[PDB]
Design a protein around this ligand. Sequence first.
Ligand SMILES: *[C@@H]1O[C@H](CO)[C@@H](O[C@@H]2O[C@H](CO)[C@@H](O)[C@H](O)[C@H]2NC(C)=O)[C@H](O)[C@H]1NC(C)=O
Ligand SMILES: *[C@@H]1O[C@H](CO)[C@@H](O[C@@H]2O[C@H](CO)[C@@H](O)[C@H](O)[C@H]2NC(C)=O)[C@H](O)[C@H]1NC(C)=O
Ligand SMILES: CC(C)CCN1CC(=O)N=N1
Length: 639
Amino acid sequence: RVRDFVAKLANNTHQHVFGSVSLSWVGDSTGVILVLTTFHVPGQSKLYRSEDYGKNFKDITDLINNTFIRTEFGMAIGPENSGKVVLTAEVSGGSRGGRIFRSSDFAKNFVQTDLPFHPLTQMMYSPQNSDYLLALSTENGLWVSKNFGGKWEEIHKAVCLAKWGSDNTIFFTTYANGSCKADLGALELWRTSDLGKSFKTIGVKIYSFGLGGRFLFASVMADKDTTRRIHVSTDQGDTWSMAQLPSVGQEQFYSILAANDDMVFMHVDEPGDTGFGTIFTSDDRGIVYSKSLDRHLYTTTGGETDFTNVTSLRGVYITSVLSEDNSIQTMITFDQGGRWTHLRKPENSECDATAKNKNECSLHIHASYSISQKLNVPMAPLSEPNAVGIVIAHGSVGDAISVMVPDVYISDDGGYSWTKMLEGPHYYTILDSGGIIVAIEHSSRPINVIKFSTDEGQCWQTYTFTRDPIYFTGLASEPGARSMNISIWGFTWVSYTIDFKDILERNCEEKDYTIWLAHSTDPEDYEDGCILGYKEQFLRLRKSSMCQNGRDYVVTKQPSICLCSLEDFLCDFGYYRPENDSKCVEQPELKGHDLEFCLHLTTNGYRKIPGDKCQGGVNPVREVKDLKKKCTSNFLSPE
Ligand SMILES: *[C@@H]1O[C@H](CO)[C@@H](O[C@@H]2O[C@H](CO)[C@@H](O)[C@H](O)[C@H]2NC(C)=O)[C@H](O)[C@H]1NC(C)=O
Ligand SMILES: *[C@@H]1O[C@H](CO)[C@@H](O[C@@H]2O[C@H](CO)[C@@H](O)[C@H](O)[C@H]2NC(C)=O)[C@H](O)[C@H]1NC(C)=O
Ligand SMILES: CC(C)CCN1CC(=O)N=N1
């Protein structure tokens, strides 16, 4: 519903003409884009650079000296504004050392450097400092560089896996003899804070390790069995604590679904080839775990899962579960995994063939699992933190995820309500923190048009961006959903970057924004909107208003602190919540893995949900008590 839109886009539209193809953005608010193509012909690499968000590209294959670049390593991009770019070149079969090309000037100038080893993994930038780097050689050697790749010293041999921690710390696992596969479950976990000068052994009998938020996790194998269990440390391995999670076997796996400063979402595989597991939410120490969701779909250790952080609203997560019927259903939690429920269906929607009742059903979302089964899904769900409460996803309306070709649904309130956005599979992108949505029909045949909306998917305009139809491949836009430049890629290889600057000529002002209470279920109630003990009220751009938010737009929100209630605490170890009300109570006797933990000790009977900011009201935390005597009450033990 924008007048004379065609005129504005026509001048703004820009076109550029150009094996294995990869595109990497460099920095924020720089517009630097690198495109790398390699082809194997019985074979040279091509590199392009753009400083205008992809409107124009300049060939810079001269800087790489026509050297072949290995696709597997890809293009290593430096942290935020470092501008560092590293490409791993291919070298002669007999070369003693590897060769890489590096740049620190956002790829304007590249310097060739030979290496003392052959890289086995991609070089990883240290988060605290861009200059520091680490890599693993073909001989499982760990090399570190303090000069952005000029000089590499082998700090330690036989490293199975290495990762960057906070403050330039390095954690790695080593194998005493043979190969990592031989020493599975017998590895040693080491840490060095001095860039290899000094080493500290923080674990033995290690299977693997992981990092999430503050937490550092390590899986340790039993002495008398194959089974392994998780141990957690918040002090970089100086002290360790067992995690109240079940032990698993070699067939089973552990996966960190999501982690942050407050807590972690942990997935434990069920015994057998079920293809599903249970989700556990931790406390602020990562030690005590609450069962959140049953029969959560996860194919294998590196397999597909539909678990999705809805990044546009606090505490909202979406995933898929396998019912006993062997049908897949989509579940959503609005309170960080405290309760899970079915997504509400759009009001003007018809239940499909999967529904028992024609007028009652739910909305189900197509994510990574649907894509892996070769369903007609071109994109997983999309959400951005800048665009408050907006979720866009492919889905079906019924009792379960259906095989039929899907339509696109949008939510403007963080997942509480939905409406059909477009018919049939599409590609979508969010721009200007929600100021514009852009969409691209997915078809077998070429396309010549791009669709855009300025009222959060409620209405759309159709604009033709080319004379000649192209075969659509993908969309590229600056990470962070703050630019107004979108790029359409396809072959007849071409790329039309549209700029929407003219469409939103007017910048936004106070009057454009309006007040919106997030998480509002019942507007009359004092407690309405309390999630994790507090409410958030937002200023968001009115749907009718069509103005640019700007690159420096700031989400404005004010927090209201609710009164603590029992619902803001979870049961500590040794307590459970009966089906009756919600007061935590001490279990008759611990069983299963709960008994394993016994043989954190002090239990308050209640602990505050991590991330919960409620103040005042009830405090149910009890004086610290010890259940060890209760635990060993049944065991005869020596004097
Ligand atoms: C789910 O996504 C949200 C949004 O990205 C995450 O919230 C961010 O967390 C980081 C790290 O704690 C903070 O620096 C940001 O300020 C948060 N963003 C907002 C908008 O609050 C959240 O941590 C994710 N959930 C999990 C479990 O990782
Ligand atoms: C879309 O891309 C253009 C470049 O083609 C961006 O233009 C830049 O704008 C900033 C500030 O407006 C200037 O400091 C830069 O010098 C501009 N670059 C060029 C190459 O002209 C434009 O900002 C992008 N749109 C958005 C919303 O970020
Ligand atoms: C949670 C952390 C120990 C991940 C390492 N992994 C994978 C697995 O399944 N066992 N250890």
